[PDB]
């Protein structure tokens, strides 16, 4: 389990790209495997730390897709699970090559109340798009 | 205006692809040009009719991105404008190579009340994913 799941997550998080098909395929897999939410987020963050900015952005696209869709898919636990890593993660995507795309994601969450105001403020400060 | 706008829309709608950057770039342009919503939707539909299934799907991704984001961007008129074409458009993406991705988009709209129930029912019937 722990080993099988680690092997899948490594393969999937290494390879996620910027296509709708890549993102939605992996998002669906994550939501199917909601039982393992905490392990999923742990490996997502591991991959975010070890990646360079372009691949960090694709991992943020995956996170956004999961966070958005997990509610209608009866897997709202992912919102709480990702909140564990988002403040640290925001600071790893401050570079202007990617921060505007992440800032957009945070604005979408804010407008829809996906996370509360005070959490989004803390994330935008970490991104350096609000001071 | 009419000619300049037609030339931009042809170029942009021909070329939209399945990447987050392609979709978001064009979505932003559309929202910037909310004054021309009706012309934008007219050319979107023209391109949808003349395209094959794969490119029709990318045009639906663009439509979804506009429809979702136009509210926070003070351009909610696009939701009403796209409603003019969506029933016809749904029927042009019935092929199983793409209908599941479009059905997903319709489910996302339904869950969030982006459009009313009776409109979504009419769209899913046109897609042949509900009978
Ligand atoms: Pr390991
Ligand atoms: Pr490994
Ligand atoms: Pr013409
Ligand atoms: Pr032309």
**Tokens 């709708």 -> residue:** A20
| Final resolution, Å | 1.8
In chain B, where does DSSP find H-type helix? Answer: 2-15, 20-32, 37-50, 53-69, 77-83, 86-91, 99-112, 117-127
Give per-residue burial for B28-61: e unless 16+ CB within 10 Å, then b. eebbeebebbebbbbbbbebbeebeeebbbbbbb
Give CA–CA dist A93/A54, Å, rounded: 9
Contact yes or no for B61/B23 (Cβ under 8 A): yes
Candidates A17, A18, A19, A20: best to mutate against B (most CBs of B within 10 A) is A20
R_g over Cα of chain B? 14
- What are the backbone dihedrals phi and psi of residue B94, each rounded to the nearest 5 degrees, phi first? -75, -25
Asked if A72 and B24 come within 8 Å (Cβ–Cβ), the reply is no
Q: Which domain holds residue B59?
A: 1-131
Who contacts B3 (Cβ-Cβ below 8 Å, separation ≥6)? none
Q: Return the SS3 of B19.
A: strand
Contact yes or no for B6/B46 (Cβ under 8 A): no
Give the number of A-B residue pairs with CB atoms closer than 8 Å. 32
What experiment produced this structure?
X-ray
Number of domains in chain A: 1
CATH number, domain with residue A110:
1.25.40.90
Compute, in angstroms, the gap from residue A48 CA to the centroid of ligand 2.
15
Compute, in angstroms, the gap from residue B113 CA to the centroid of ligand 3.
34
CA B62 to chain centre: 6
Candidates B20, B21, B66, B69: best to mutate against A (most CBs of A within 10 A) is B20
Q: Return the SS3 of A19.
A: strand
Per-residue CA distances from B46 to A42, B77, B85 (Å): 46, 20, 10
Q: Which two tokens stand for residue A16?
A: 């996620």
């Amino acid at each position: 389990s722990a080993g099988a799941l680690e092997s899948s997550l490594d393969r999937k998080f290494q390879s996620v790209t910027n296509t709708m098909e890549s993102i939605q395929g992996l998002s669906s897999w994550c939501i199917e495997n909601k039982k393992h939410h905490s392990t999923i987020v742990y490996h997502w963050m591991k991959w975010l730390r070890r990646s360079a900015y372009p691949h960090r952005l694709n991992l943020f696209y995956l996170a956004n897709d999961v966070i958005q869709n997990c509610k209608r898919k009866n897997a709202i636990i992912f919102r709480e699970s990702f909140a564990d890593v988002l403040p640290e993660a925001a600071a790893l995507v401050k570079d202007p090559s990617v921060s505007k795309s992440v800032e957009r994601i945070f604005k979408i969450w804010e407008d829809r109340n996906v996370y509360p105001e005070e959490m989004i403020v803390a994330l935008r400060e970490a991104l350096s798009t609000t001071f």
